[PDB]
Amino acid sequence: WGYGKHNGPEHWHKDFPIAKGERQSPVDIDTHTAKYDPSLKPLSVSYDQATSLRILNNGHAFNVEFDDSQDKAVLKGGPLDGTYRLIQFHFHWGSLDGQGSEHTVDKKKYAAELHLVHWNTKYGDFGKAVQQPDGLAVLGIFLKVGSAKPGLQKVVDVLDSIKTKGKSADFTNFDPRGLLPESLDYWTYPGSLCTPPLLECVTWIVLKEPISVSSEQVLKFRKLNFNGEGEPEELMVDNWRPAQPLKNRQIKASF
Ligand SMILES: [Zn+2]
Incomplete structure (x- = not known):
């Protein structure tokens, strides 16, 4: 599985049949159809x-991985019940500014999308949580090209150190918090992991x-490689999944 012509998302169903299931992700968010839910509580981000x-x-x-052995970075409130701990964050991005996000808003595509992955502490570990319908909570953040984001520069400067597949670097x-927008207003819907095994265990926010x-910050993303060191160079770009059928599910809005 990958994002090329021969292993791309249109092929994922052959090894992961769930790819054509009922609660797949990402999806197009139709703002005129999303239902404002007054019963929706404010998000609670304690990082x-x-x-x-x-x-x-x-x-x-x-x-970017995090120590999830204690309630240190946690998400609660919103549509959630209980505590979800931050385990990692990653991005999806394109080859150009016109594409790259997973979710789309009224069919508009962003240059990238940030996913903050959190797992429900009642299930005791991440691997158990993926097996549950309310097992994960993912915070999606869209990225548009304009002004630099100071809080993202530390991520950008280390990309050189992990250019190829399998490389890792200490990152304490x-x-x-430097990645969050001023407003916490959101849409939410039941969905799945945005990559294989594509398990339908996520509460998307x-x-x-x-x-x-x-432009300079996203440029640095486009310089990563899908390949391992010593293999032909395959730039890491367009690592995003096309929008999937909403199939009945409803998208609620907190605003
Ligand atoms: Zn993702």
């Missing part, structure tokens, strides 16, 4: 105690407000 450990190129993206004292990054 002041976050502990980042490292960053790695897994051959389809780069992940990174504060996720997509924020309405995009963060802007500079």
Whole structure:
């Protein structure tokens, strides 16, 4: 599985039949159809105690991993019940500014999308949580090209150190708070992992407000490689999945 012509998303169903299931992700968010749900509580993002450990190129993206052994960086409230702990964050991006996001808003595509992955602490570990319908909560953040995002520069400067698949680098004292938009207004819907095994265990929380990054910052993303060191160079670009059928599900809005 990958994002090329021969292993791309249109092929994923052969090894992961769930790819054509009922609650697949990402999806187009139709703002005129989304239902404002007054019963929706404000998101509760507590990341002041976050502990980042490292960053790695897994051959389809780069992940910034976090120590999830204690309630240090947690998400609650919103449509959620209980506590979800931050385990990692990664991005999806394009070859040009016109594409790259997973979710789309009224069919508009962003230059990239940020996913903050969190797992429900009642299930005791990540691997158990993926087996549950309310097992994960993912915070989606859209990225538009404009002004630089100061809080993202620390991520950009280390990309050189992890150019190819399998490389990783110590990455401590990174504060996720520098990646959040001013508003916490969101859309939510039941869905799935955006990559294989594509398990339908996620409560998606997509924020309405995009963060802007500079052309120079996204450029640095486009320099990563899908290949391992010593293999022909395959730039890491367009690592995003096309929108899937909503099939009955309803998208609620907090605003
Ligand atoms: Zn993702």
